[PDB]
């Protein structure tokens, strides 16, 4: 259920990001149509500029949160699949790299780290050979639906929106802007 | 079939290392008994000191090349075992890491490197989870005899004398002195 929990977390994050970008687009089109009009309304255009700026900041933050949630759900799926599969095949995987496993319990910390790094490097060449052979494969059978729905990669729109970042001072300034807009808009 | 070559290389390296060790022991014991003896030939003492130092250098080099051969044969055995293991159960391994392996062909250098790094982190966490329970195992069935006869790690006597490092000029002058010793003892 934990994988399902992360899946629905990412789904509602995606929904929030989508509605945020829809609101941003509506604000932008309203601003441009008002600018096309003959009315001056300097205060109106200034407040619309502030609104669109804070809304695009919110869209960027939502995209970043969606990226983090997607990474989290992929990571938890990876860890659970690896745990269950290795439990099903503990002996085979252990004997594959056996000569560097005995004595691990009492091994010194530096030697322990060096041994596990050597094991990872040994698996690196197996992964390289597997990708060189380039066999076609899909997600795990047990959670194929969740992994297909979550997508192999996040949407490119979130990638380009999250490409640019902001300094923490601007982050907190925009957080205050969001708080005040929510406060004065609820009335 | 390079495993057999590595095995016999390790065997003859061990034989040469034992020969160097026993000849060094003989040289040092005869030097000690001549020191305790009534003889006062200072030239004999100086030449015995030269023999002792050159034999110590030869033993150090033999230990170094034995360590290199042992690590080489261990790497070859690990590579072969992992290769046949992935040829046996590699599809399930690829499925377990599917969320970061799809479309590897068209990925750029940075994307491929990051995906490989994430896969290494995943397998590292799986390995540490497996090692947490401390499930004891043995050597690989196909090549158990070679691993047993080469040992899990080289003995202390092969590393305790190899903890001293020589500058390249020292190595060159010791090589020249060893060549002179061989030339003078051949006649």
Numbering used by the authors:
A (entry chain e), B (entry chain f): 4 to 190
Tell me what the authors wrote about this structure, in their words:
Phage satellite P4 polarity suppression protein, Psu, a building block of the viral capsid, inhibits hexameric transcription termination factor, ρ, by presently unknown mechanisms. The ρ hexamer adopts an NTPase-inactive, washer-like, open-ring conformation until NTPs (preferentially ATP) are engaged and RNA is bound at the SBS, leading to ring closure and RNA entrapment inside the ring. Our cryogenic electron microscopy structures of ρ-Psu complexes show that Psu dimers clamp two inactive, open ρ rings and promote their expansion to higher-oligomeric states. ATPase, nucleotide binding and nucleic acid binding studies revealed that Psu hinders ρ ring closure and traps nucleotides in their binding pockets on ρ.
